[PDB]
């Protein structure tokens, strides 16, 4: 048996999604003739509170388009977090493709940036010609590398006040924005109100196979089209993909709460083991991610043992469960939940974790 | 009734394709865990005679990845045609994204480049440090802007001899490579043998909704992966799209011959009208495209009249056919055939053309 | 004896220039505290009829700054000539540094672009989002590769009318602008009136060791400063160089006429030889350059023989003159005059040419 | 009277330098025909222990060329300090020109990078294709923003061991490398032994008006030539500037010690005042810079008062000294010494500082 908690991107299409793709009404999106893509873009615009949206192949391209759309001036700068996904896991595309300078600030704690450090940075070269012009403050909600932490609304409000005062825009990587809205029990628009543009990903917790989009004003999306075209994201009959994304958008408020509960149950379960090797504070499990601190064992070996199966596992547990995880830091692993991990899969992953921990107990 | 000959990208998925998408076995392609994508990449590699292939969202990204993969040296240059699709209809991405210099040579005649001009250009800065280093010769087969002209094998052989002598690679934009192979009645590999890398598009004549790929050696595709990632083409469960592309690849040798026949029938039909306004040489209709020369009427108005319907059309023709076309040059329009244009649609488009021509006859 | 006609860049500083450098009042130009640089920028602004000017190290950087200043929009395009210096002999910097697309048009004939082809190109993607936006028309006066041909004022007037109608700017590479003004016997401002920005080079015919500048409006030069800084052209005590440039600017109207006369004398002299190997039309020698057509001998060997000295040369000529020249095309060489080539040096170069031609006469 | 301690770039040429420029033997450097430039490049290569050197207009271009020379791979990364000059005061050229990603690490303390953080960063994506490839570790000696701190030899040795193990090169911004060599009383080559390439600036403490250069192997300088050309640093008769740089290179070991003594005298003098507003630890004044901590007064106003002159200054001091300084941080100012600040100017600047401090004493 397999329980894959490496990422929520591994979500596979359900039967309602598979039917929607085979029954999609499509056209050439490059000509603006795909009705299902237009339906997705209009519904997502209403959900996010933006004027327009633009369907793209990946959330990577959506972030890259947004940065290029705000930071067009030669000698522009993005203020972002040093552990945000754009700065670490996107090939440095801000530089090698957008040609924009990046100024990273510490964000590990709770995915938030120190408002004092952010103000000092926004003021350093706010008018001096010797410094690059900060045209964008880049935010990520939820913050992936911090464990799926939720950015509060008031923090988002303070960032926009600080950015819009120094003549900068605000973009929010909302690759897991619905995970944040459900955690706060607020409509997603309340978070997007405090930003100029937003990314939104269907291929993670929502369960769609392919797709993301850029949200913003008409003018910003108007120029996002040319950038999508130049990067090679201007597909033809994309309504096949948008049909599946429409299904996941409707099931979001019902599917995502179960991912948060399963992650919280796992964190509480690991805590109830009182192991001197693994330590988790369930109060830090805000969404679908659990960061487990490891001691005395390299995190890679913990993932290797949890993925392997032994005859003694079948003895003291009963089942043979292969738990898939990623080593995150030098002293921690990361578990991500999604709709293909059932609550019974979660209990089985807890039992595998008990067995592995016991077989190496100091 | 609608007969859309603007482009072969408007092909809509058939029932076999719609079923394949709903029945696709998928995984995360970013982890290399989608079996249907791997099946498409292996079959296409055997079809094209390359070591590996890499599925991408669009043929635009496939060309951009190839140029970036060959022209990485700072101060690199691409030798290409001044009417090739990359140089005209791709937002100048060779420059604004790849940062590579372009040297266009005349290609309008038959999509071919003068081998003397190509040799003189390859020799100008072949060793001088004052000139950019030519690292790629860019070819397009079939050539779109010239009317779908087929590049002969011997011409491809001479280009590689000239390019590989001066230390340059050869990439072939094969957005309509199967249209060329069927026209020559040869396996597609015979054309790809004379190039280092190749693009291949499923979303045109093959009929798939979304998808293209890069073909080449293992090492070239190995680095194409990082470039696909940075540009935002690294999708997750792309096996949904690759399932439809596998169907069109199997129906290619049976679907494309009908597109060439319908285009040839139309060109002969227009010729049998002997109109002093429209003139076509059917000998120039090598694939699925027909360039119609217009006189005394702006090509935009000809497209407007062919798209419109009048009561007199219903009189002298019987049916109300809306023929969709694009104005190509200042004195010509362009018609492109595909599997959604039936042979009976072709005859109806001929009758609409007769009516329009007669109602403005000088 | 050496007569170096390879280029007019080989001009060495005179005693008045050497004194001006040692007596220059200088400061930190980066702080705007060098008075001699400010004096040069103000005098050149009055000479060219622009609002401001910005001293730069090379004419290469001046052209690169101008292109970057006009073509900042992502997906911008420059319309230029396929034999202009920017497109051929500047490492493709428009692409690898500015990230701008280039659309070259034929200019070899007389350094001019066909106004019909220029209008058809400016109209192709003037409003379509599928094409790059043409934001600059790039002109070169005098045109180097064509033999120092002068662009007429009326042609410059027609280009601006055509460019400013389609929302594009006009930049003029005036690396040899004074050579054109003296040829037309008009103030240099009459040429710059028909452009938005201009380059101007002191290190060629004017005789300065180092220096060039960008001319334009206050706002354009204001942003040219940031670009000069980013490229590494923001020098400190540049008044040392600007002092020598001020001397050459004052001697221009007296030094350059002698270069045109010496070149014209050489062209007439070569014609009076009636050789079936070398042919020049003196009517094509508009400035300080002479293109000599060669037959039966590779142009490289002609340069080798003219540079070499034999005992038979000392016999039938009397002196041993080493004439330095560059092979230009496959059938032509290029001679460029400057202030370090005296009129007596010109006669000696004619005699060397007679001897070489006679010793291989068919 | 003026005492300008804003920067050491304000050094003006001396009479020996002014004579050297007027007596320089020059040629076209673009053709490699300037003997004085070749003399400077050979002497500097012997001084630095590198194979070749390449004269450039500014130290900004020298750093930009080096980064571009090492980080050519698409998706390359530079590891540097977040307060190094390249990352803060160079328009973000690593991004907007070189297209390279930057990973800044904390360096403020002593200009050094934590070897553990540097190892963790070099190991994160050392082999993973999901991360950019670190091809350069960027060091600055002396570190400007930290107060001219000297990087020890052993630290340089440990950085190269760590960088060369993970397949990265090491470049050292030696804008003030001679200030470090004199401080350590070691030949400059001992520092350059622990790097692959080096920058070296003549226009600061050495006193030359214009000039810098890149040092490295033959192959690295060979490609630096093409990059210098593309950026517009390929000057013609640069031997005018190289003659002055040769004079400053010979006077370095005699001029720079006086700048360190004057700075140390000032730091001790300010300390002997025991003011609760200004505080300096003379042990932190390693070279020609003094960072003065300010309290109760914004650093801009302290610079304003020290620059202004009052009748009460002429009373209690005797002279009217205008001390020029830059505000550095929110709580500190920065003073930089050079050969145009005499030791008697230093004492006068101390007396002005006493007067200003006393007139606002809490």
Contact state of A75 with D92 under an 8 Å Cβ cutoff: yes
Q: Which residues of C touch B102 (CB under 8 A)?
A: 95, 101-102
Contact state of B73 with D75 under an 8 Å Cβ cutoff: no
Rounded to a whole number of angstroms, the distance between the first and last alpha carbons of chain A is 28
Residue A292 CA neighbour count, 13 Å, CB half: 34
C-alpha torsion sign, points B158, B160, B165, B166: positive
| Two structure tokens written together for B282 | 């059917």
**Determination approach:** X-ray
D18 touching C (Cβ < 8 Å):
yes
Contact present, A352 and A4 (Cβ < 8 Å): no
Which H or E run contains C2? Answer: strand C2-4
- Euclidean distance between CA atoms B328 and B326, whole angstroms: 6
Chain B stretch 94-133, residues whose beta carbon is closer than 8 A to a beta carbon of chain C = 94-97, 99-102, 104, 120, 130-132
| Distance to chain B for C130, nearest Cα, Å | 6
| Two structure tokens written together for A273 | 């083991």
Q: Which of C282, C287, C279, C265 is nearest to C333 (CA)?
A: C279
**Cross-chain CB nearest to A232 (options B11, B60, B209):** B60
Contact present, D94 and A95 (Cβ < 8 Å): yes
**Exposed, middle or buried: residue A127 (CB in 10 Å: 0-12, 13-18, 19+)?**
exposed
Length of chain D: 362
Residue D147 CA neighbour count, 13 Å, CB half: 20
| Two structure tokens written together for C86 | 């920017």
- Euclidean distance between CA atoms C12 and D104, whole angstroms: 45
**Cross-chain CB nearest to B104 (options C95, C104, C120):** C104
Q: Which of D112, D114, D134 is nearest to D123 (CA)?
A: D134
Helix, strand, or coil (residue C11): coil
- Euclidean distance between CA atoms A343 and A336, whole angstroms: 13
| E strand spans, D246-339 | 278-279, 289-294, 322-324, 326-327, 332-336
| DSSP, res B10 | G
Task: Note the helical H segments in B14-129.
Answer: 15-22, 35-48, 59-70, 85-88, 93-96, 115-124
- Euclidean distance between CA atoms C221 and B233, whole angstroms: 40
Cβ-proximal residues to B161 (8 Å cutoff; 6+ apart), any chain:
none
- The alpha carbon of residue D189 and the mean position of all alpha carbons in its chain are separated, in whole angstroms, by 17
| E strand spans, chain D | 2-4, 52-56, 76-81, 101-105, 133-140, 169-174, 197-201, 212-216, 278-279, 289-294, 322-324, 326-327, 332-336
**Exposed, middle or buried: residue D32 (CB in 10 Å: 0-12, 13-18, 19+)?**
exposed
- Euclidean distance between CA atoms B71 and B63, whole angstroms: 12
Backbone discontinuities in chain D, residue before each (C to N > 2.5 A): none
Q: Which of C82, C52, C193 is nearest to C145 (CA)?
A: C82
Q: Which of A337, A329, A302 is nearest to A7 (CA)?
A: A337
Q: Which residues of B touch D68 (CB under 8 A)?
A: 74
Strands B289-294 and B332-336: antiparallel
Characterize C125-164 residue by residue with b for buried, 16 or more Cβ atoms within 10 angstroms of its Cβ, and e for exposed: beeeeebbbbbbbbbbbbbbbbbbbbbeeebbebbbebbe
Q: Which of A144, A81, A147 is nearest to A117 (CA)?
A: A81
**Exposed, middle or buried: residue C5 (CB in 10 Å: 0-12, 13-18, 19+)?**
buried
| DSSP, res D149 | B
Contact state of A92 with D75 under an 8 Å Cβ cutoff: yes
Query: Is CATH 3.90.1150.10 the classification given to domain A253-358?
Result: yes
Contact state of B96 with C76 under an 8 Å Cβ cutoff: yes
- Euclidean distance between CA atoms C133 and C120, whole angstroms: 14
**Exposed, middle or buried: residue D304 (CB in 10 Å: 0-12, 13-18, 19+)?**
middle
- Euclidean distance between CA atoms B74 and C96, whole angstroms: 7
- Euclidean distance between CA atoms A256 and A188, whole angstroms: 13
Percent of chain C that is helix, strand, coil (3-state, to 5): 45, 15, 40
| Distance to chain C for B33, nearest Cα, Å | 35
Residue C53 CA neighbour count, 13 Å, CB half: 27
Q: Which residues of A touch D99 (CB under 8 A)?
A: 95-97, 99
Radius of gyration of chain A (CA): 21
| Distance to chain C for D115, nearest Cα, Å | 30
Query: Chains meeting B at 3+ CB pairs closer than 8 A?
Result: A, C, D
Q: Three-class SS string for chain A?
A: CEEECCCHHHCCCCHHHHHHHHCCCCCCHHHCCCHHHHHHHHHHHHHHCCCEEEEECCHHHHHHHHHHHHCCCCCEEEEEECCCHHHHCCCCHHHHCCCCEEEEECCCCCCCCCHHHHHHHHHHCCCCCCCCEEEEEEEECCECCCCCECCCHHHHHHHHHHHHHCCCEEEEEECCHHHHHHHHCCCCHHHHCCCCEEEEECCCCCCCCCCEEEEECHHHHHHHHHHHHHHCCCCCCCHHHHHHHHHHHHCHHHHHHHHHHHHHHHHHHHHCCCCCCEECCHHHCCCCEEEEEECCCCHHHHHHHHHCCCHHHHHHCCCCCEEECEECCCCEEEEECCCCCCHHHHHHHHHHHHHHHHCCCC
- Euclidean distance between CA atoms C173 and C29, whole angstroms: 24
**Cross-chain CB nearest to B68 (options D72, D74, D230):** D74
Q: Which of D341, D203, D246, A129 is nearest to C237 (CA)?
A: D203
Contact present, C249 and C202 (Cβ < 8 Å): yes
Cβ-proximal residues to B277 (8 Å cutoff; 6+ apart), any chain:
B294, B295, B296, B297, B357, B360, B361, B362
Q: Which of C14, C18, C16, C24 is nearest to C243 (CA)?
A: C24
DSSP B323-350: EE-EE-SSSEEEEE--TTS-HHHHHHHH
Closest chain C residue to B73, measured at CA:
C96
Characterize C282-300 residue by residue with b for buried, 16 or more Cβ atoms within 10 angstroms of its Cβ, and e for exposed: eeebbbbbbbbebeebebe
**Cross-chain CB nearest to D91 (options A75, A88, A102):** A75
Residue A25 CA neighbour count, 13 Å, CB half: 6
Q: Which residues of A touch C75 (CB under 8 A)?
A: 226-227, 230
- Euclidean distance between CA atoms A135 and C166, whole angstroms: 29
- Euclidean distance between CA atoms D222 and C17, whole angstroms: 32
Contact present, C314 and C321 (Cβ < 8 Å): no
Query: Chains meeting C at 3+ CB pairs closer than 8 A?
Result: A, B, D
Chain B stretch 25-44, residues whose beta carbon is closer than 8 A to a beta carbon of chain A = 26-28, 30-31, 33
Query: Chains meeting A at 3+ CB pairs closer than 8 A?
Result: B, C, D
C-alpha torsion sign, points A142, A143, A148, A152: negative
Topology alike, domains A13-250 and A253-358: no
Residue in the structure block whose two tokens are 């192959």: D219
Mutate to test the interface with A, among B8, B17, B209, B238 (most CBs of A within 10 A): B209
DSSP B116-145: HHHHHHHHHTSS-TTS-EEEEEEEESSBTT
Contact present, C337 and C8 (Cβ < 8 Å): yes
DSSP D76-108: EEEEEETTSHHHHSSTTHHHHTT--EEEEE--T
D92 touching A (Cβ < 8 Å):
yes
| DSSP, res D284 | G
| Two structure tokens written together for D301 | 């106003």
- Euclidean distance between CA atoms D173 and C352, whole angstroms: 51
| DSSP, res D143 | B
CB atoms within 10 A of CB B128: 11
| Distance to chain A for D89, nearest Cα, Å | 6
- Euclidean distance between CA atoms C307 and D181, whole angstroms: 48
Q: Which residues of D touch B74 (CB under 8 A)?
A: 68, 72, 226-227, 230
| Two structure tokens written together for B71 | 């022209």
- Residue A120 Cα distances to A166, A225, C124, D107, D110, angstroms: 11, 34, 47, 18, 22
A73 touching C (Cβ < 8 Å):
yes
- Euclidean distance between CA atoms B291 and B271, whole angstroms: 12
Contact present, C280 and C354 (Cβ < 8 Å): no
Residue B121 CA neighbour count, 13 Å, CB half: 26
Contact state of B72 with D73 under an 8 Å Cβ cutoff: yes
Chain C stretch 212-251, residues whose beta carbon is closer than 8 A to a beta carbon of chain A = 225-227, 229-230
- Domain assignments of chain C as residue spans, ordered by start: 13-250, 253-358
Q: Which of A288, A259, A87 is nearest to A173 (CA)?
A: A87
**Cross-chain CB nearest to B132 (options C91, C101, C120):** C91
Q: C-alpha angle C49/C55/C60, rounded to 5°?
A: 100
Contact state of A74 with D95 under an 8 Å Cβ cutoff: no
Task: Note the helical H segments in chain B.
Answer: 15-22, 35-48, 59-70, 85-88, 93-96, 115-124, 153-165, 177-184, 189-192, 218-231, 239-250, 252-271, 299-307, 311-316, 343-358
- Euclidean distance between CA atoms B205 and B210, whole angstroms: 12
Closest chain B residue to D99, measured at CA:
B99
Contact present, A300 and A222 (Cβ < 8 Å): no
- Euclidean distance between CA atoms A176 and A201, whole angstroms: 7
Strands A197-201 and C101-105: unpaired
Contact present, A266 and A346 (Cβ < 8 Å): yes
Q: Which of B200, B83, B94, B195 is nearest to B145 (CA)?
A: B83
What's the farthest any 2 CA atoms get from each other in chain A? 70
Strands A289-294 and A322-324: unpaired
Which H or E run contains D265? Answer: helix D252-271
D195 touching C (Cβ < 8 Å):
no
Strands C332-336 and C326-327: antiparallel
- Euclidean distance between CA atoms A169 and A172, whole angstroms: 10
Which H or E run contains B322? Answer: strand B322-324
Contact state of A94 with D100 under an 8 Å Cβ cutoff: no
CATH topology of domain D13-250: 3.40.640
Contact state of D227 with B74 under an 8 Å Cβ cutoff: yes
Strands D133-140 and D76-81: parallel
Residue in the structure block whose two tokens are 């940062």: B99
């Amino acid at each position: 048996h397999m329980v894959d908690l490496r990422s929520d991107t591994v979500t596979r299409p359900g039967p309602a999604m598979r039917r929607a793709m085979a029954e999609a009404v499509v056209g050439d999106d490059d000509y603006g003739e795909d009705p299902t893509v237009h339906e997705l873009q209009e519904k997502a615009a209403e959900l996010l509170g933006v004027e327009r949206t633009l369907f793209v192949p990946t959330n990577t391209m959506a972030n890259l388009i947004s940065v290029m759309g705000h930071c067009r001036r030669r000698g522009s700068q993005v203020l972002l977090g040093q552990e945000c996904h754009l700065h670490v896991y996107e090939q440095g595309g801000v530089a090698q493709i957008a040609g924009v300078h990046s100024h990273p600030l510490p964000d590990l704690p709770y995915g938030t940036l120190d408002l004092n450090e952010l103000e000092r940075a926004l003021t350093r070269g706010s008018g001096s010609p010797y410094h690059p012009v900060c045209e964008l403050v880049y935010l990520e909600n939820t913050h992936s590398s911090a464990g799926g932490r939720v950015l509060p609304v008031d923090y988002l409000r303070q960032v926009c006040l600080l950015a819009h005062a120094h003549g900068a825009r605000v973009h929010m990587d909302g690759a897991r924005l619905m995970n944040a809205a459900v955690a706060l029990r607020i409509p997603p628009a309340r978070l997007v109100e405090h930003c100029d543009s937003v990314s939104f990903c269907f291929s993670k917790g929502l369960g769609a196979p392919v797709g993301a989009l850029v949200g913003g004003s008409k003018d910003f999306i108007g120029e996002a089209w040319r950038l999508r075209k130049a990067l090679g994201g201007g597909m033809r009959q994309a309504g096949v993909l948008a049909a599946a994304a429409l299904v996941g958008l409707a099931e979001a408020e019902e599917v995502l709460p179960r991912d948060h509960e399963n992650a919280q149950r796992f964190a509480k379960g690991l805590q109830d083991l009182a192991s001197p090797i693994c330590s988790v504070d369930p109060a830090t499990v805000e969404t679908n991610m659990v960061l487990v601190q490891v001691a005395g064992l390299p995190p890679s070996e913990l993932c290797q043992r949890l993925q392997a199966v032994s005859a003694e596992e079948v003895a003291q547990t009963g089942r043979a469960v292969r738990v898939l995880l990623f080593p995150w830091t030098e002293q921690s692993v990361r578990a991500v939940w999604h709709r293909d991990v059932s609550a019974q899969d979660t209990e089985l992953a807890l039992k595998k974790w008990e067995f592995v921990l016991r077989q190496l107990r100091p």
